[PDB]
Design a protein around this nucleic acid. Structure first.
Ligand code: MG
Ligand code: MG
Ligand code: MG
Ligand code: MG
Ligand code: MG
Ligand code: MG
Lengths: 126, 264, 313, 379, 285
RNA sequence: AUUCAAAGGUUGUGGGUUCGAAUCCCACCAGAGUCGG
RNA sequence: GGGCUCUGUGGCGCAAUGGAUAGCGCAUUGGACUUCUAUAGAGCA
């Protein structure tokens, strides 16, 4: 599958990692086939060296941002804020509060999805 | 104005009006750690004293609502008048309980006197029919919760490290005080979260009637957060219906917040 | 690559023992720090036996049908085989097939005609009425079993049934040790715990969803559910040593709470290594033969429930 | 009682012996065949209880019978020529084996209980050695094994046709261990046994082109349900399968040409009328009788040794763990492993002496301390 | 300067009698299910009002006892104990020690008995309140505040808490040969295996109490108590978790009695228990 | 992520004072400590 | 073995009283969880 168009297009983006690109490919495969998203693309942020997927869960709703991270890495709240600002710069619309989705991927391609927002979110009143 | 007693670096409140003022005016709730005078064989409800965190006591000293003193020590020159006063008070409070005791006893007798007379007459008439057929430990004393004599204490300085305030300068205290003060200014109620794997619990109102909404974790803006820790904390927050907050004070004075929630 | 009576040889490919029944060495390829097997025999043998690895698309096993589950009841009235796909998914495969078409130099007006002849090893698309017609294969999507690092090493080192290829040249458990240690800087402790556990008959799987290091199944995911949730640590035989992740009393309280909610036990594992050991003696796998293991179980003593440990019906 | 039978051409004389009886027959006039062996002029030969004699005649004959017979009569219901047809067809294979530097055909007589496995095996072996051939005989039916005691696997080098009553003379007869009456108790044994003896005669036929050309004859179990057919295909594709002949249950034909390679010629046949019912008691006492004709010999010509064997002399492995000596070892068997040298039977136990007394076909010492004990008992 | 702290509420006779005729049932903490969203007009407000006016009544309650149910005690700070001036009561079956002909109590037992209301503490011919007792008895020389918190928490459930005197004591090789778990080249240790040479680091955590269950209260022999139910280390919640060397040291000190860790988090008690474990090789199917 | 309700009795045994005893008095069992032998 | 002191209340730890209605907690059994994880299981502002 290594010749998949998206794998080589991810290679194209001059990021500088083998971990990040394969993990991004894994999350793309998890989204576009299992979870049935529509029109998922891959943008590179060289300010942070981050290969980040920008997609649409179902056609008609706004864009979402997904940063595929492995478990070996670790973040600081300053880098979290950096990625919040990057995401807002990326999808563009300054109305809704900044937010992205962190996809922690294991070694055997096991993915966990968490959502980071900027501010106070209530537990489950939606 | 209120006064909190700081001994060895821990802050206690011993009055019942100071706790009411604290909670009903300043949004500070504390934690009752004592025993109950009526429930002393149970761990469900506890009474005075009320224990304050160091951050709550520092915030209350700064906004000017309390006065942190150092716990006084007996003067030893005010002892003889103390002794004679205690002796007089004990004697008079003892010999004045006898009067209302006697009155209350006559009252508890005249209320059911008819029953006494009926039973006595039944007793002695059955005795007749058979004849034809044959102080201390009662004196009450009070065990005070808070010292009953006015003393003089010396005000404590919380912006200088000392013996009974070892907190000034420590980094964890500065961090947690930054976040506590920011959250408290926003109108929230706050408590400690050890059993929930966090630093604070954040309520939209008095915790007597509301469930908490957030578990807050104080972080330095450059410390690295281990991912596994984030996953465990998000799972625990999902299990108890609480968002996971991430708080960090920025050099420019303002604190930044970030919510974490499980998605799919 | 030995610790077994069958083929205790590091990387001889010239198999010769004599008195044996039938051993068939498995195959795997290392693509950018991930071991994958691309053969159906290999996949089915590794997963029906011991439950090794995870399917790269599905959740539990490599059983991702590229068919659609909702429309299985659509036309089960007919007699056909597995492939039945809605139109737009094959249209998207045609999108990233015209990707390949333009990337190989063929212009658009000939690409359209060539694939129109290919829209006349192959598939069956579906479509008032909705019918179906046979199509040609848009894109290869064959399954791959993705093996963890510790898993693949336990397979090559401790059993010998697996051979890893890195640019078509097989590896050895000297440089395999080196490579796995240099890509995942904490491969040694995790493989030592994995080896210790799977040698007692248990089945170790990754515990990412709970925040721990491993989960132990009695006989496998489909038969039983996990009982223990393990965290791994390394120390010296004078108990000197750094930590993988430092444990507060908030990490342990949270881990214990979320393990009680899911009916599991929080085991802390320690690996004690001698002080006379050197960072080049521990650069060989056989250092394993001189390191000790110690488990502890962390629990939550409830004050009010243990004041009479005689009362039970 | 003297009875005269006239067996004209293409006819089967069906007769078998009553219990504890004696039967005496002699080819007075003409020629006759016994399961493939042409009986000699006027030879008075004897028949014992339970023995089956379905003698077909090539040229017809005049036969004398003095004695009692359970069943004894003439029958024109005879498929035996179809027998020959198979042979005659495979007779091609015979010389065609050494035509193009190929090796001979090997043939299966497959089918359930009551089919005549050993009958076709009889005739095929005898006719093989009749046309100058020298066939390999592999018998696997551990229920009524005759290559050895039942509960073992065996192989025969057929030097000349079998005699009238007793049969092919055992000279270096291949024996290997199974231990139990039925392969339903352990299949792995039958598996590696099949492979073992198959490659064994691989080596023998490549170093003795004799049987390579002359092909081989096999006897397999009469199992048709469970792993019987799976082991049947295992054996066939291991035994260089050339031709397989099904015995009068065409269910075997269907699944047999459904699970063999295309190269395999599957030929079905209805069994002869001479296949008689033999229930539990039959093979019961015929198994104990095979033990008897191992250890005491036909007509009592074997005189075995009855005395002690040391526990400090021998170690046994039980099919994998050696069994601690316990009094469960009485009247079991013991196999001397080299292949196998021979077999012995236990009679009594000595605890504080630590020796158990055995009966032996050869004297002391036993050529190996390698022994494998039985699962079935005989005393 | 010097601020003058006001102090104390003195119950009058008429209120001492009223506090004698007190009930026993605790008020309910929340009156039904707590809420989730503070947006409201008058139900939430009145519910909070009632839930508060009940709290300010509970905390404004003083202890009132009889002068005969009260043992008279004295606080010797130089020798460092409490001396009873009268024969003790039912607490003397599990608490105290008799030396030189007199009955004596450790400072934490004395403070807990003052809180329950069984004794009457004096110091220099003057009785001590609970604030003064908290300040005098809870130094670093006698007993700390967290240790007293754990002590009283346990003692209010029924346990026997004594001081710990150190002088107290399958896979795809489709080979039909399975024994082959010989792969085990990783030896298992235990917790007390090598704790007698680790005690050289006699610093850090320490055992503080022995704990006997509540079934042992009716037939407790202070002179010959037996083997305890647990031993207790008392730490704080913000403190470092104990290492493996400290765990081995404490598990060798304790013996074969289990060892529990009590953590106090700004007034909230929690108990954990490390225990050495031996995974059962048995998994045979 | 907690919150509410119900059920549960030889007041060691016997006697006495009393209109009325878990309550006050005596005796007798069972237990703990101390003095000591 | 003798003297002196103290104790005995619901399965367990305990209240109560001039002497005038034997109830609190833990454990147990049931409900609601605006609860969660999934017929369960777990519930520590
Ligand atoms: Mg609760
Ligand atoms: Mg009485
Ligand atoms: Mg009582
Ligand atoms: Mg009772
Ligand atoms: Mg009781
Ligand atoms: Mg009453």
């Amino acid at each position: 599958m290594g010749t998949h168009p998206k794998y080589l297009e991810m290679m194209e983006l001059d990021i500088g990692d083998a971990t990040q690109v394969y993990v991004a490919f894994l999350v793309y495969l998890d989204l576009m086939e299992s979870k049935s998203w529509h029109e998922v693309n891959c943008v590179g942020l060289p300010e942070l060296q981050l290969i980040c997927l920008v997609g649409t869960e179902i056609e008609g709703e706004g864009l979402q941002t997904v940063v595929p991270t492995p478990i070996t890495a670790s973040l600081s709240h300053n880098r979290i804020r950096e990625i919040l600002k990057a995401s807002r710069k990326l999808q563009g619309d300054p109305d809704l509060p900044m937010s992205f989705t962190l996809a922690i991927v294991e070694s055997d391609s096991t993915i966990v999805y968490y959502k980071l927002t900027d501010g106070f979110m209530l537990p489950d009143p939606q | 104005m209120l006064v909190v007693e700081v001994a060895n670096g821990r802050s206690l409140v011993w009055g019942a009006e100071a706790v009411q003022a604290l909670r009903e005016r300043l949004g500070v709730g504390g934690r009752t750690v004592g025993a109950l005078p009526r429930g002393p064989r149970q761990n469900s409800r506890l009474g005075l004293p009320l224990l304050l965190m160091p951050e709550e006591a520092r915030l209350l000293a700064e906004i000017g609502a309390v006065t942190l003193v150092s716990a006084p020590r007996p003067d030893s020159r005010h002892h003889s008048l103390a002794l004679t006063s205690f002796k007089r008070q004990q004697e008079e409070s003892f010999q004045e309980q006898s009067a209302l005791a006697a009155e209350a006893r006559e009252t508890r007798r005249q209320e059911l006197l008819e029953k006494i007379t009926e039973g006595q007459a039944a007793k002695k008439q059955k005795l007749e029919q058979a004849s034809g057929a044959s102080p201390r430990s009662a004196l009450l004393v009070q065990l005070a919760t808070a010292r009953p004599r006015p003393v003089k204490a010396r005000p404590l300085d919380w912006r200088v490290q000392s013996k009974d305030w070892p907190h000034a300068g420590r980094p964890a205290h500065e961090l947690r005080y930054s976040i506590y003060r920011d959250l408290w200014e926003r109108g929230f109620f706050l408590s400690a979260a050890g059993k929930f794997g966090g630093d604070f619990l954040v309520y939209p109102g008095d915790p007597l009637r509301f469930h908490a909404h957030y578990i807050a974790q104080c972080w330095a803006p450059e410390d690295t957060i281990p991912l596994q820790d984030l996953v465990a904390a998000g799972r625990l927050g999902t299990s108890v219906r609480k968002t996971l907050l991430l708080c960090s004070p920025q050099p420019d004075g303002k604190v930044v917040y970030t919510s974490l929630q499980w998605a799919s | 690559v030995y610790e077994t009576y069958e083929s205790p040889l590091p990387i001889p490919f010239g198999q010769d023992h004599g008195p044996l029944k039938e051993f068939k060495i498995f195959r795997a390829e290392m693509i950018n720090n991930n071991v994958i097997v691309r053969n159906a025999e290999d996949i089915e043998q590794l997963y029906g036996k011991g439950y090794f690895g995870k399917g790269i698309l599905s959740r539990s096993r490599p059983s991702f049908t590229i068919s659609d589950p909702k429309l299985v009841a659509k036309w089960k009235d007919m007699k056909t085989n597995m492939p039945i796909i809605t139109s737009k998914r094959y249209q998207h495969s045609v999108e990233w097939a015209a990707e390949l078409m333009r990337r190989q130099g063929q212009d658009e007006s000939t690409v359209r005609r060539i694939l129109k002849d290919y829209t006349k090893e192959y598939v069956l698309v579906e479509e008032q009425r909705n019918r179906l017609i046979c199509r040609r294969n848009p894109y290869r999507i064959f399954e791959y079993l993705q093996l963890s690092l510790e898993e693949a090493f336990f397979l090559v080192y401790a059993l010998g049934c697996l051979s890893i290829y890195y640019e078509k040249e097989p590896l050895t458990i000297v440089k395999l040790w080196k490579a796995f240690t240099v890509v995942q800087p904490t491969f040694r402790t995790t493989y030592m715990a994995y080896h210790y556990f799977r040698s007692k008959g248990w089945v170790p799987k990754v515990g990412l969803k709970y925040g721990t290091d491993l989960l132990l199944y009695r006989k496998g995911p489909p038969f039983y559910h996990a009982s223990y949730s393990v965290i791994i640590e390394l120390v010296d035989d004078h108990f000197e040593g750094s930590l993988r992740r430092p444990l507060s009393w908030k990490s342990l309280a949270a881990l214990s709470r979320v393990s009680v909610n899911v009916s599991k036990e929080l085991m802390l594992c320690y690996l004690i290594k001698p002080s006379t050991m050197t960072d080049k003696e521990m650069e060989s796998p056989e250092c394993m033969k001189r390191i000790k293991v110690q488990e502890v179980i962390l629990s939550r003593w409830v004050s009010s429930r243990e004041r009479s440990d005689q009362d039970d019906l | 009682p003297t009875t005269k039978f006239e067996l004209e051409r293409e006819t089967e004389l069906r007769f078998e012996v009553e219990a504890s009886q004696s039967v005496q027959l002699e080819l007075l006039t003409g020629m006759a065949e016994i399961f493939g062996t042409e009986l000699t002029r006027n030879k008075k030969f004897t028949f014992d209880a339970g023995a089956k004699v379905a003698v077909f005649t090539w040229h017809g004959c005049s036969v004398q019978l003095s004695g009692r017979t359970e069943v004894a009569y003439v029958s024109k219901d005879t498929p035996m020529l179809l027998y020959l047809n198979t042979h005659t067809a495979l007779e091609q294979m015979r010389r065609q084996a050494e035509k193009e530097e190929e090796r001979g055909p090997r043939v299966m007589v497959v089918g359930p209980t009551d089919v005549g496995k050993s009958t076709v095996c009889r005739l095929l072996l005898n006719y093989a050695v009749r046309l100058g051939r020298r066939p390999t005989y592999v018998e696997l039916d551990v229920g009524q094994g005759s290559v050895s005691i039942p509960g073992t696997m065996g192989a025969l080098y057929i030097e000349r046709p079998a005699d009238v009553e007793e049969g092919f003379s055992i000279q270096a007869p291949l024996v290997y261990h199974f231990g139990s009456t039925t392969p339903g108790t352990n299949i792995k044994l039958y598996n590696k046994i099949t492979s073992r003896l198959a490659d064994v005669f691989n080596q023998r036929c490549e170093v003795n082109r004799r049987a390579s050309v002359s092909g081989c004859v096999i006897n397999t179990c009469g199992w048709v349900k469970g792993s019987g057919y799976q082991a049947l295909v295992h054996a066939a594709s291991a035994f260089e399968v050339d031709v397989v002949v099904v015995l009068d249950q065409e269910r075997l034909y269907n699944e047999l040409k459904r699970d063999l390679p295309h190269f395999v010629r599957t030929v079905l046949l209805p069994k002869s009328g001479g296949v008689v019912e033999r229930s539990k008691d039959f093979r019961r006492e015929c198994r104990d009788e095979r033990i008897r004709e191992y250890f005491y010999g036909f007509r009592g010509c074997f005189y075995p040794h009855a005395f002690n064997v040391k526990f400090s002399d021998v170690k046994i492995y039980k099919v994998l763990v050696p069994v601690t000596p316990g009094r469960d070892m009485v009247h079991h068997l013991l196999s001397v492993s080299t292949s196998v040298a021979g077999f012995i039977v236990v009679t009594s136990v000595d605890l504080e002496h630590q020796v158990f007394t055995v009966l032996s076909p050869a004297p002391r010492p036993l050529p190996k301390n390698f022994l494998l004990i039985m699962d079935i008992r005989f005393m | 300067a010097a601020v003058e702290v006001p102090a104390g509420r003195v119950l009058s006779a008429r209120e001492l009698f009223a506090a004698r005729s007190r009930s026993q049932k605790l008020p309910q903490r929340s009156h039904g299910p707590k809420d989730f969203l503070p947006d409201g007009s008058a139900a939430q407000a009145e519910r909070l009002r009632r839930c508060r006016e009940e709290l300010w009544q509970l905390l404004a309650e003083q202890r009132v006892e009889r002068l005969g149910s009260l043992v008279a005690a004295e606080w010797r700070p130089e020798e460092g104990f409490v001396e009873l001036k009268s024969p003790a009561g039912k607490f003397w079956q599990t608490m105290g020690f008799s030396e030189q002909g007199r009955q004596r109590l450790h400072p934490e037992e004395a403070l807990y008995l003052l809180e329950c209301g069984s004794i009457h503490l004096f110091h220099q011919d003057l009785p001590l309140s609970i604030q003064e007792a908290y300040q005098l008895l809870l130094t670093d020389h006698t007993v700390t505040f967290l240790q007293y918190q754990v002590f009283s928490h346990l003692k209010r459930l029924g346990y026997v808490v004594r001081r710990f005197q150190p002088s107290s004591v399958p896979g795809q090789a489709s080979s039909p040969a399975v024994v082959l778990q010989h792969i085990s080249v990783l030896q298992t240790t235990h917790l007390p295996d090598g704790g007698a040479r680790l005690l050289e680091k006699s610093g850090g955590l320490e055992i503080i109490f022995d704990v006997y269950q509540a079934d042992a209260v009716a037939t407790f022999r202070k002179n010959n108590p037996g083997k305890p139910y647990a031993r207790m280390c008392i730490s704080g919640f913000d403190e470092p978790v104990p290492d493996l060397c400290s765990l081995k040291r404490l598990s060798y000190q304790s013996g074969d009695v289990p060892l529990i860790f009590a953590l106090v988090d700004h007034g909230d008690i929690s108990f954990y228990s490390f225990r050495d474990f031996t995974l059962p090789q048995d998994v045979g199917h």
